[PDB]
């Protein structure tokens, strides 16, 4: 599923991501935009052989099981395929564990490089929330 910008902001808010670990909703929408262009079916293969899955490009090295990332963990206790669902519940629940891991949203290199310190409120401007 390709979300609309305000459609994704509503789904994230409903699942409690708005101001989670102090990150305003525009931070999460900005990260999803640059990670996945709001596509739940986004995938990216990393050089190390791990894969990033879903709207927030969550990686198999630590967070999900895909059966093909030697030495990896599954700390969100999910198949990585769950991260590609039109239902963002698994992505959000796993994002909450990631952003609690110590480095906040720096865990998302695209958030650090393209969202951090920018006017992230523009990502929820005009949305009925
Ligand atoms: Na894994």
Curated annotation (Swiss-Prot):
Predominant location category: secreted
Bridged cysteine pairs (disulfide): 6-127, 30-115, 64-80, 76-94
Alphabetized PROSITE patterns for the sequence: GLYCOSYL_HYDROL_F22_1, GLYCOSYL_HYDROL_F22_2
Reactions the enzyme catalyzes: Hydrolysis of (1->4)-beta-linkages between N-acetylmuramic acid and N-acetyl-D-glucosamine residues in a peptidoglycan and between N-acetyl-D-glucosamine residues in chitodextrins
Catalytic residue list: 35, 52
Tissue: In the egg white and polymorphonuclear leukocytes.
Misc. remarks from the entry: Lysozyme C is capable of both hydrolysis and transglycosylation; it also shows a slight esterase activity. It acts rapidly on both peptide-substituted and unsubstituted peptidoglycan, and slowly on chitin oligosaccharides.
Protein name: Lysozyme C
Species, as recorded: Gallus gallus (Chicken)
Gene coding for it: LYZ
